[PDB]
Homo-oligomer: A and B are copies of this chain.
């Protein structure tokens, strides 16, 4: 045929219809929008025909003369896609910024997008994932290096849950970035085990402690879902309104928003069987997760066995208002809490981006994507994960669908942790489950229980803990 098979393969890999992708590329390289033409061809006995041409890059993209609209338009779209595959180019925009003002976070914002396009040139299949972008930066005495970068704003569906823990539950960018940070921390711990001088960790009184001058910064291109996005009102007016706005919220499946529960609502714990019967899964919003990470550290329960708690040093959101709105959700709620020793409340610096608020390209027609991507410096390669099931899909030698667990799933983290046990001659009990391993950190578990009890006491909300079956798989 007149259409190369590579064009069809690209169309299939993109996941979009040929017309939409061709129109998007036409908008990307040119300042116009394709408009089809339907000139007719008359046979001696009479006929009706459709062609569709479109003019891109000065080439005649006139399609085959066919009877009906559908085949003519798909042929024209395929020809235009062949044209765009020819003369390999892609959307790029030079960066400009104002200086001499507070623009430290603008550098982080611009560099995150620049690093995003660098991986895009290596793997073009990850284009269009700019709707939600998060990154983690590490600062050492005025020198900053990116660590993690990830996308995604969807969650695992209820019917696709498994008890073996190889399926990701939350695919939000600000959580995948934290997972990449934990992977980088695992790599750093391994480096300390093999070369203490070249590592950022040092031997402390009880566990590994970060060297002086080491700090981590988190940047998100949009405000996290939850308390920070409820309202923009300057004043609440009443004490009840202030209390209501600061209460916890939870997410539901792929739902873009959040649902607020009252006192002693949803008190019954979630059940594994009930979810399979049709009950919708409830997951806490990103604001409450950030609050929990600030209170209890970002290292988690498992990594607490070797390293001291680590907290974010600064949070940057590319929004104009920012300031008090995000502070109230991140620090003010747990300001009065007094955790035990170790672990403590961190006064994370809150910063506002200079200019170039990202809401038009993050909240307009880009929500149709279902695939999320994660990247970390420890691995050095990009990975795409389908948010519908939390697993990566690929084509085998015969072209059939093959699925393998993601590198950041619970099973892979447990395998890495056990590999750390084996490499450093750290003997562990056997057999042990994932839940038992997390419960081994007495201090972390006690701090988490105290924080949950204090949250309940302050009538802020009720934590909807996941069913125990999600962590009941045995570690091998």
Contact = CB atoms under 8 A, between A and B. Distances in A.
A276 B231 CA distance: 9
Interface centre among A258, A268, A468 (most CB of B within 10 A): A268
Nearest to A244: B472
Given A163-B231, A280-B268, A474-B241, A274 B257 contact: yes
A277 B230 contact: no
A363 B253 contact: no
Q: Is the interface of A mostly helix, strand, loop or mixed?
A: loop
So how many copies of this chain end up in the complex? 2
A142 interface: no
A469 interface: yes
Contact of A271 (B255, B268, B363, B469): B255
A251 to B, nearest CB: 9
Contacts of A255: 268, 271, 274
A154 to B, nearest CB: 13
Interface residues of A, number: 40
Interface string A272-287: 1111111110000000
A305 interface: no
A258 B271 contact: yes
Interface in A202-230: 225-226, 229-230
A269 interface: yes
Contacts of A320: none
Contacts of A229: 273, 276-277
29 contacts: A163-B231, A225-B273, A226-B273, A229-B276, A229-B277, A230-B469, A238-B474, A240-B431, A240-B474, A241-B473, A244-B472, A253-B268, A255-B268, A255-B274, A256-B271, A256-B274, A256-B277, A256-B279, A257-B270, A257-B273, A257-B274, A257-B279, A258-B271, A258-B274, A259-B271, A260-B468, A268-B280, A277-B363, A278-B364
Given A260-B469, A278-B364, 19 more contacts: A225-B273, A226-B273, A229-B276, A230-B273, A240-B474, A241-B473, A241-B474, A255-B274, A256-B274, A256-B279, A257-B272, A257-B273, A257-B274, A257-B275, A257-B279, A258-B273, A258-B274, A259-B271, A268-B280
